[PDB]
Design a protein around this ligand. Structure first.
Ligand code: LGT
Ligand code: LGT
Ligand code: MG
Ligand code: MG
Ligand code: MG
Ligand code: MG
Lengths: 358, 373
């Protein structure tokens, strides 16, 4: 069979008090001439950690059959056995895992979505239109309308400030400005305690929001389950979880209507697929967090209509762009992820290492 | 209001006297373990107080731990050293996308341990007394350098030697393809040492459910202190089923890297003896949470590795614990653990009572520091 002969990893600081995002890129090449590209990231601390671990375990891939992806995921995990099956170690593993899936799809001359098997050619999308809790409503409404004009399918508004009546008034304003035909979601970013979340969720019910995201602390599964059980409005959460096991807990507690796994954060496509499988089984919906260039493919393979958020943050890393039209994000049709590194990455790369022969 | 003013971290690669080669090595799927990467943390305050802490990685993970610790370290400067759990949370939040387990929290654990060391010293108490102890000595055991592939006669001699020097029990590695072989080996050790020497076995996750069922059943009449890691570290339902059926205590947990994971073991009643590793779970703070959950569930404790730290933690547990004696980390420190009549003496010096040995500098590959002393 084929075998991995070369691997290169690099830490790229993408310029945007978040001033930059640390990206970990993984490049894998095989004796058969096949190639794959993958990545993971860290918004805050963690970039140097992911890279250092990735650099130490990369050699374990040399000589292995690229097609046995899950097997390799497990092998690299064992390479750092005392490091755990979550967190920084598996996120570093994720960059390689994504590269291998990219490579396999390309081997089949198919987009990642088609390799996995698709249910749709485009996915519903939304954005925050640069909106923040401190953004004047007037400014946000304008930016939101511009997004709808450009094809976005929904708007997610930040909420969770001490004065809840203010958030309610802000959402009412956007609803009036955009009309009942524009879907809206709110993200409390874990800012409410249980009683407040109960009161805020009850007030939002008549608004018919698509979902209320992270009303509680990321690990308060029982709290989230209680909210979901009681309210019609879907509860969304999961972006902070870093393993299939943590998502498994959410599902077991029925703490989320919309699961929000982040492939890079949970250790790559392999663990993401196991989470998606558990979610499908449990009858849940999917709303992947961040990294649309990767999640658009993963969402396309989910059986029930998902939502993917449009972000411009990572665009500069790649030559290709995502296309949006009429409230939906088009699933790329190029082989694999359909991504190649922009020449600009050269300037932002702070660390790099390679092993094997090309 | 004291404040942290200086922090120093270093990555020390400790050479091992003898390489560790498990089944994976013998089957040619991995290299023998010949060193351990230690992450050392030193914290100093305006009030002049000092603390030393550490974490470690057996296989890959050292560079990652150090790298992360270096990036979050400055977040300690200016903070009150006494608010330990608060600071644990703060550093965790500084790398919130990294999760609450694994490499990130193991890096945090090195600082956490230094803070506890510093608080104990501030009170002029050993860590054990700071927490409150239930005993001045803890039952101990060792492997006597025995491995699955060590000649039985040699293992028995070394084991007799350990007992002679005061060790209180012997843990034997089992789990090879041919189970009858493991049985005969335990039988020989039992015969060589006598009925009065406690014995435990470690399968190191090598059995599948049906095999574990059969081996545990054969081992019942041996009255072992415990059968450790008979299954995969995450097969909670399998461990619980074994524990429920057999009298012999089931021990596991050394591979877990967070309070939440140990919480899962306890919830499933997957272990009679919980084996948390403070460094691996994120330090003393998470360890204490685990111990409280364990005490409440009525379980027993058998901390994994790092005796220099776990001797203090075991002393603070209500029910009689077991701590394993290892000589691996000794070269790193000037102090030594005392063993007598089957128990290891809880150190009485302030804090953890550890000071870096002169040999540590030479083994230091990476280091950094922030703030001024
Ligand atoms: O859902 C989201 O994208 C937010 O919840 C972000 O992940 C958040 O951490 C932060 O990056 C932001 O943009 O407010
Ligand atoms: O219980 C133990 O100490 C063993 O299970 C070790 O942790 C093991 O990983 C290995 O280091 C060994 O000593 O065989
Ligand atoms: Mg969010
Ligand atoms: Mg509901
Ligand atoms: Mg063990
Ligand atoms: Mg039992």
């Amino acid at each position: 069979s084929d075998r991995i002969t070369w691997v290169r990893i690099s830490s790229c600081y993408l310029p945007l008090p978040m001033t930059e995002i640390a990206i970990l890129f993984a490049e894998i090449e095989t004796a058969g001439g096949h190639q794959g590209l993958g990545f993971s990231y860290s918004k805050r601390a963690g970039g140097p950690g992911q890279f250092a671990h990735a650099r130490e375990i990369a050699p374990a891939l040399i000589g292995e059959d690229p097609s046995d992806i899950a097997k390799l995921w497990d092998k690299l995990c064992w390479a750092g056995a005392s490091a755990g099956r979550s967190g920084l170690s598996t996120q570093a593993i994720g960059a390689f895992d994504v590269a291998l899936w990219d490579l396999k799809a390309k081997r089949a001359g198919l987009s990642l979505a088609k390799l996995l098997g698709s249910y749709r050619d485009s996915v519903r999308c939304y954005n925050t239109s640069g909106g923040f809790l401190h953004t004047p409503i007037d400014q946000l409404m304008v930016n939101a309308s511009a997004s709808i004009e450009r094809g976005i399918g929904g708007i997610k508004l930040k909420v969770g400030q001490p004065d809840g009546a203010l958030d309610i008034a802000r959402v009412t304003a956007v609803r009036k400005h955009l009309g009942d035909a524009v879907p809206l979601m709110v993200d409390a970013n874990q800012q409410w305690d249980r009683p407040t979340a109960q009161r805020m969720c009850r007030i939002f019910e008549p608004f018919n929001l698509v979902w209320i995201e992270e009303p509680l602390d990321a690990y308060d599964h029982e709290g989230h389950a209680a909210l979901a059980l009681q309210f019609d409005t879907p509860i969304a959460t999961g972006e902070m979880l870093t393993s299939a096991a943590e998502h498994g807990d959410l599902i077991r507690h029925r703490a989320a209507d919309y699961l929000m796994p982040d492939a890079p954060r949970v250790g790559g496509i392999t663990p993401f697929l196991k989470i998606a499988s558990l979610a499908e089984h449990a009858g849940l919906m999917l709303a992947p967090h961040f990294a649309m260039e990767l999640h658009v493919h993963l969402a396309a393979a989910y059986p029930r209509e998902p939502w993917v958020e449009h972000f411009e943050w990572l665009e500069p890393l790649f030559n290709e762009r995502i296309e949006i039209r009429d409230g939906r994000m088009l699933v790329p049709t190029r082989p694999g992820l359909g991504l190649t590194l922009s020449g600009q990455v050269k300037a932002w790369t702070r660390e790099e290492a390679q092993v094997g022969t090309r």
